[PDB]
Every structure is written in structure tokens, then in C-alpha cells.
Amino acid sequence: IDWAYYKATVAKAGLVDDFEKKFNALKVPVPEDKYTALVDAEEQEDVKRCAEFLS
């Protein structure tokens, strides 16, 4: 994303500087995992079945 410095070196730099100030304010969301708990849910049941089988 080093183009901002290039834009400053670019002849068209004035309003591009304000837009870069806007660009630095950009934020990107991070998705949140949802199936992580579902995978952990079945492990307890499988462990119980394994213990009963062993006995």
C-alpha cells in the first residue's frame, strides 16, 4: 500500500494528500468464527462413548 508516498511524489499530490488522510482512516473488518463451538461440542459425547466402550 506504499502508493501513498508515490502519490506524494506523483505530480497530482495536493488533494490526493487529503484523500490519503482519508485512506489512513480506512478500517477492514475481521470475520468471526462460528463453527468452532460446534466442533468442540461433539468431542465430549465421543469421549463418553469411548469410555463406555472401553469399560
- Which range binds other proteins by CB under 8 A, 5-13, 14-22, 47-55? 14-22
Q: Which three cell numbers stand for residue 29?
A: 473488518
| Secondary structure (DSSP) of 13-27 | -HHHHHHHHHHTT--
Instruction: Pick the stretch among 4-12, 20-28, 47-55 that binds other proteins (CB under 8 A).
Output: 20-28
Of positions 1, 11, 15, 37, contacts other proteins by CB under 8 A: 15
* d(C-alpha 43, C-alpha 50), whole Å: 10
Task: Give the rounded distance of the alpha carbon of 29 from its chain centre.
Answer: 6
Task: Note the residues at the interface with other proteins (CB under 8 A).
Answer: 15, 18-19, 22-23, 26, 28-29, 31, 34-35, 38-39, 42
